[PDB]
């Protein structure tokens, strides 16, 4: 069954980049996928993402500029202590300066670099580099 | 109470083959069968071949340990087809 909506969306995003296409359509729209796309858009990995209203579960059309290498989801959402937001950085992404792990925190769903400054720790949603 | 349900009467006697065979036949002999005439499960055996309904009150000829028998069920069916033909 479709347990992880994010994984299906992000694998489609990365498969479309690997062939190299300008628009991809994601079959299930989730407010968490919409937030994940937003963090990537702000950082500039992706462009405009459009949520078509199915009136059922909805769809998303994400415009791909071609700068994303690997975007993934860490499942189960694991619990990351603040004195471990750095341990995840080396195991998951390439170089401390390049790449972003998104972790949900009481403050919100934010990239690790922001959380490290706030001295907060959350639950990891996924890795986009 | 376990494998030898009705053959416990025999006790540790007569050997397994006889007791296993008796368990099939004796269960069938002591069973209640449906009257062809009254369609009620009250036919029981009085003697080998003689089966009487305790509701219909009708005596029918039958198998020694069953109201109907496999050779006889075949015969009625062949007779009906052949009778329909002639």
């Amino acid at each position: 069954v479709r347990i992880n909506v994010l994984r299906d969306a992000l694998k489609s995003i990365c498969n479309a980049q690997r062939i190299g296409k300008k628009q991809v359509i994601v079959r299930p729209s989730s407010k968490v996928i919409i937030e994940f796309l937003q963090l990537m858009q702000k950082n500039g990995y992706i462009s405009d993402f459009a949520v078509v209203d199915n009136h059922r579960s909805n769809r998303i059309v994400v415009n791909l500029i071609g700068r994303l290498n690997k975007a993934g989801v860490i499942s189960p959402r694991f619990d990351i202590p603040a004195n471990d937001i750095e341990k995840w950085v080396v195991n998951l992404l390439p170089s401390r300066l390049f790449g972003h792990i998104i972790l949900t925190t009481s403050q919100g769903i934010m990239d690790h670099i922001e959380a490290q400054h706030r001295q907060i720790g959350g639950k990891v949603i996924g890795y986009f580099y | 109470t376990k494998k030898v349900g009705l053959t416990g009467k025999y006790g540790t006697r007569y050997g397994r083959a006889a007791r296993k065979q008796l368990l099939k036949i004796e269960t069938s002999q002591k069973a209640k069968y449906t009257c062809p005439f009254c369609a009620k499960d009250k036919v029981r055996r009085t003697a080998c071949g003689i089966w009487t309904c305790r509701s219909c009150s009708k005596t029918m000829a039958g198998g020694a340990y069953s109201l109907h028998t496999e050779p006889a069920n075949a015969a009625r069916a062949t007779i009906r087809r052949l009778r329909l033909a002639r």
Binding site: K22, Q23, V52, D53, N54, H55, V61 | -
Partner: protein, 80 residues
Amino acid sequence: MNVDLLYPDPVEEQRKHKLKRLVQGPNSYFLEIKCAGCQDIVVVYSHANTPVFCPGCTSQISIPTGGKCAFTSQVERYRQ
């Protein structure tokens, strides 16, 4: 050709399955049809599998099929 998504071709969308589409939508419509005995128009489903009787001729005007309902008596066309 620059044809893209979010704004796709209507003809191309029809060929695609109703649910495998940007908006899952009905493939069936209602039909305005006129019977031989009665000139009033009865609105019917295009894929009615139910036995449907004309408000005039007693016999059913609907013949049920695997896809679109076929009709037995006089036929009008295109509901408006």
